[PDB]
Design an enzyme around this catalytic site. Sequence first.
Site, PDB file in Angstrom:
ATOM      1  N   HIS A 480       3.134   3.449   1.663  1.00  0.00           N
ATOM      2  CA  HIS A 480       2.934   4.758   1.105  1.00  0.00           C
ATOM      3  C   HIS A 480       3.088   4.804  -0.417  1.00  0.00           C
ATOM      4  O   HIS A 480       2.084   4.869  -1.128  1.00  0.00           O
ATOM      5  CB  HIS A 480       3.893   5.750   1.769  1.00  0.00           C
ATOM      6  CG  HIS A 480       3.602   7.177   1.421  1.00  0.00           C
ATOM      7  ND1 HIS A 480       4.517   8.190   1.612  1.00  0.00           N
ATOM      8  CD2 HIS A 480       2.500   7.758   0.892  1.00  0.00           C
ATOM      9  CE1 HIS A 480       3.993   9.333   1.208  1.00  0.00           C
ATOM     10  NE2 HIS A 480       2.771   9.099   0.768  1.00  0.00           N
ATOM     11  N   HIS A 485       0.186   6.174  -3.864  1.00  0.00           N
ATOM     12  CA  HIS A 485       0.657   6.837  -5.084  1.00  0.00           C
ATOM     13  C   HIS A 485       0.671   5.989  -6.356  1.00  0.00           C
ATOM     14  O   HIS A 485       0.015   6.321  -7.348  1.00  0.00           O
ATOM     15  CB  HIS A 485       2.075   7.372  -4.876  1.00  0.00           C
ATOM     16  CG  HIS A 485       2.151   8.473  -3.872  1.00  0.00           C
ATOM     17  ND1 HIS A 485       2.135   9.805  -4.229  1.00  0.00           N
ATOM     18  CD2 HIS A 485       2.186   8.441  -2.519  1.00  0.00           C
ATOM     19  CE1 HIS A 485       2.159  10.551  -3.132  1.00  0.00           C
ATOM     20  NE2 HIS A 485       2.190   9.745  -2.081  1.00  0.00           N
ATOM     21  N   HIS A 671      -4.192   6.915   2.411  1.00  0.00           N
ATOM     22  CA  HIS A 671      -3.049   7.770   2.169  1.00  0.00           C
ATOM     23  C   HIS A 671      -2.827   8.790   3.299  1.00  0.00           C
ATOM     24  O   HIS A 671      -1.695   9.018   3.702  1.00  0.00           O
ATOM     25  CB  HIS A 671      -3.190   8.498   0.832  1.00  0.00           C
ATOM     26  CG  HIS A 671      -2.083   9.463   0.572  1.00  0.00           C
ATOM     27  ND1 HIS A 671      -2.205  10.814   0.816  1.00  0.00           N
ATOM     28  CD2 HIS A 671      -0.799   9.258   0.201  1.00  0.00           C
ATOM     29  CE1 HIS A 671      -1.038  11.403   0.606  1.00  0.00           C
ATOM     30  NE2 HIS A 671      -0.169  10.482   0.234  1.00  0.00           N
ATOM     31  N   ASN A 675       0.529   9.051   5.415  1.00  0.00           N
ATOM     32  CA  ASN A 675       1.304  10.191   4.953  1.00  0.00           C
ATOM     33  C   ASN A 675       1.494  11.328   5.955  1.00  0.00           C
ATOM     34  O   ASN A 675       2.611  11.783   6.180  1.00  0.00           O
ATOM     35  CB  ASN A 675       0.652  10.799   3.699  1.00  0.00           C
ATOM     36  CG  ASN A 675       1.484  11.967   3.121  1.00  0.00           C
ATOM     37  OD1 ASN A 675       2.507  11.741   2.508  1.00  0.00           O
ATOM     38  ND2 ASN A 675       1.051  13.203   3.354  1.00  0.00           N
ATOM     39  N   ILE A 820       0.033  14.773  -2.121  1.00  0.00           N
ATOM     40  CA  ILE A 820       1.392  15.105  -1.712  1.00  0.00           C
ATOM     41  C   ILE A 820       2.059  13.803  -1.263  1.00  0.00           C
ATOM     42  O   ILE A 820       3.301  13.778  -1.122  1.00  0.00           O
ATOM     43  CB  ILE A 820       1.365  16.146  -0.545  1.00  0.00           C
ATOM     44  CG1 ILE A 820       2.784  16.682  -0.279  1.00  0.00           C
ATOM     45  CG2 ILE A 820       0.706  15.517   0.691  1.00  0.00           C
ATOM     46  CD1 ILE A 820       3.445  17.207  -1.554  1.00  0.00           C
TER      47      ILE A 820
HETATM   48 FE   LIG Z   1       1.878  10.729  -0.219  1.00  0.00          FE
END
Ligand SMILES: [Fe+3]
Length: 820
Positions: A480, A485, A671, A675, A820
């Site tokens: 993750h 990110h 993602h 996520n 997010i």
């Molecule tokens: Fe994320």
Amino acid sequence: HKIKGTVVLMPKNELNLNAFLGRSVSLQLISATKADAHGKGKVGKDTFLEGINTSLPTLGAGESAFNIHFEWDGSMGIPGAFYIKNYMQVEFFLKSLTLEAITIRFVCNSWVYNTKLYKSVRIFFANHTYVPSETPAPLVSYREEELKSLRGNGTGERKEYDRIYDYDVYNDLGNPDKSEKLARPVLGGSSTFPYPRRGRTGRGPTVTDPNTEKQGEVFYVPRDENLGHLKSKDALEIGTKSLSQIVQPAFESAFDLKSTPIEFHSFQDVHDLYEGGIKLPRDVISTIIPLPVIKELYRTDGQHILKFPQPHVVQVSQSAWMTDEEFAREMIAGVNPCVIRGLEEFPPKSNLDPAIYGDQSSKITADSLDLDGYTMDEALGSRRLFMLDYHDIFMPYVRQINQLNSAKTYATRTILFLREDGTLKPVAIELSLPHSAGDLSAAVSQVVLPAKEGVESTIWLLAKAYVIVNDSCYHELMSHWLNTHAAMEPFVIATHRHLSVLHPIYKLLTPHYRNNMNINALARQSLINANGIIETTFLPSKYSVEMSSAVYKNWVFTDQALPADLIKRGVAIKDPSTPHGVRLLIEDYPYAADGLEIWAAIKTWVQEYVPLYYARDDDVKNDSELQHWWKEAVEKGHGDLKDKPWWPKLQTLEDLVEVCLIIIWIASALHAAVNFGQYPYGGLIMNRPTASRRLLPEKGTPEYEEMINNHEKAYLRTITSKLPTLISLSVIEILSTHASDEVYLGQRDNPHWTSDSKALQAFQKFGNKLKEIEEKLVRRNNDPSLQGNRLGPVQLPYTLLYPSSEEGLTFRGIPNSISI
Ligand SMILES: [Fe+3]
């Protein structure tokens, strides 16, 4: 003689009208066809907003339209851009400018601060798309100057209104000025700690360390990266800050004051969290209940009760998570479905130095495994043996992690057998510990085999817990944080620094960057900072982030492509005769099977888009911006790995397609898959423990007796404690939530992002394809023959790669970006 234009904007208080009139806002049209004595498009007169337009209903989102007319004789050519100056004290959000009968559209979506704050006037271009060699000559200089402006000069403390994109290392996580204990190694810029770069903020050195950036109340991101929201509940990214700074302290006091038991004593105490809830001090509930975002996390009686939402994983069976079936199934359809690997030899081998960690030979014996009647050679040859291998990954850190108070882990390895019915079953777990002369600890490595009865069943359950602690840590920090990110930010920075808003690749990629720098900046401040959320809730503590740097040493851009990943992990083999060019070795591998469908849809889209702007390979090699973009993305953004041979060269249409396809895949589907299942699977702490606090107990100790007499308590004492659990559950609940203003794959925030109908038609097909794909996945989830892996005993249909979703904690939906 006059051009009728409509300006749509949003007053700051949305994310009265009349104040925008008068001489508050002026716009100057710029010609893309008629140039001055220097070759630069002619600029018109300052034209102010005339009045409030209230004609077309199609105008929501607290938006307001303004009529304006420009003195533009056909002699000034055709307008291709425009300057805008805001004379008001407060900034406003410019949505767009539309010029009728000449229609010319400008998609701005940018905050315009008071004119005195800008070094140069804000410039916006029409929605036409141009590679550099196609830029109208009068706009050429304006194009390069705006890029120069976006790059800044690499110095200075960035301000809220700056739109300066640059790089810097992760030297802003430690807080040495507050305490030496909060000092952290700089991640990035060294061979010891290579790491993707992040957005430069320039706050300056701390007082005690010139290599560490001082603290800041606000971690800057180029202004337009900081997404405003019409609904406060949608500002999910601010949740982490509130949680770390306001809620966490409130939770701690309740524990310091002994107003709630310090530990969970039974599994029912955990289930209570989403049933009757947890009773906390009034002033604790009062501190939480009014905070935006945070208040959406729990139901409350407004007095003493906080109730978490029931996690999807327990919605049908609250006990199914404990089954071996679910344990293995989540490795291919869970929150972290991309680590399992094929095992082609036995026993599993280690590349670690025995001189340092002791003999690294596996202690798992082939004859001890139940492979449903298969011999080891048969299992190996039929490609039915797999593993979740954290041995080499964790071993280098076990000693330091275990020296911590309240942290004890094993470097685990789990062997899985692919049964004839197509489901995976766990057949052994090896719990390894480093061994070196002089070790003070008597704890030793051991192999645990499946058991359904007695203390053996408890030991096996704890073994699964140690494995999932390894997995949760790897999932959060690598699958993750690092792989999505952190790895993506460098490309966001480079894109804004080198591809003009006019550039087709800019238009192709930027939707996939929405909110990425923003959440990352907030993460550096409250999630991965010294004593931040991750360090205070996950096993590695102060070693968490540097562990991701060690992993990054082996990060390979081209291995992020889904087919490559599956092939590299030995879970698929190249097979030209198949639709996707790969044959899955676990045919009903939900993440991979659904992933290939999305991967293919994105590929078709990129392959249909690129040709619209690049006819031949030479056109790619000769795109100056594109070459500077990729060169910087690699040599600066991921500069610590610039010496690696696998970086694509970007001299061919093939390479461009590949690079864009991988970037889009990482930002959207990859993602989403890692996520949005966080709370759905991890909301029950027993299913996804984030930490382990003690090793297996020695027979003849009170701890061993507890395993026999109170296995739930033995389990709870081993995993994440109640306080950090409350905090971690809150953060993953936030992170698993889809804001109602999210823009999903197959969607754009504006239907006029480009004037090129060709690109627009291709995008529409891409969207229809995604809808088509969703129907197919629905059919897969409804197929009784695929129930074992797509639903499991938890009866949770694998919907994480369904393209679409409504807002909320839905367990489905693929956003365009790491939002997010
Ligand atoms: Fe994320």
